[PDB]
Amino acid sequence: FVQTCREEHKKKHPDASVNFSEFSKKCSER
DNA sequence: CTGGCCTGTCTTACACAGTGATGCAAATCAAGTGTGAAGCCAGACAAAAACC
Known part of the structure; x- marks a missing residue:
């Protein structure tokens, strides 16, 4: 998904x- | 008693295996270095997966 x-x-x-x-955190949070 | 004539040895022809040498084409080397292509790093984390 992250890509x-x-x-x-x-x-x-x-x-x-x-x-x-932070991008990890954001993709995680969705 | 002597052929023709249906049969296993004999006799070289003959291809070729493979020897060290040869000869020519094609890599290769060697220097300069600035690139571009390539796998890797880190951290929080979630998929696609098998274990009780």
Whole structure:
């Protein structure tokens, strides 16, 4: 799932390179 | 008593196995280095899986 989540968020966060720990937490929380 | 004529030894022809040498084409080396391609790192965590 995590790849798809991050791919969707590529536009959600306009140009940010997101953290590993926090992105894990977010994909986890959904 | 002597052939023709239906049968196992004899006699070389003949292919070729394989020897160390040979000869030519094609890698290879050697130097310079800046790339690009590639597997790996870390941490919180959840899938797809088998164990009581």
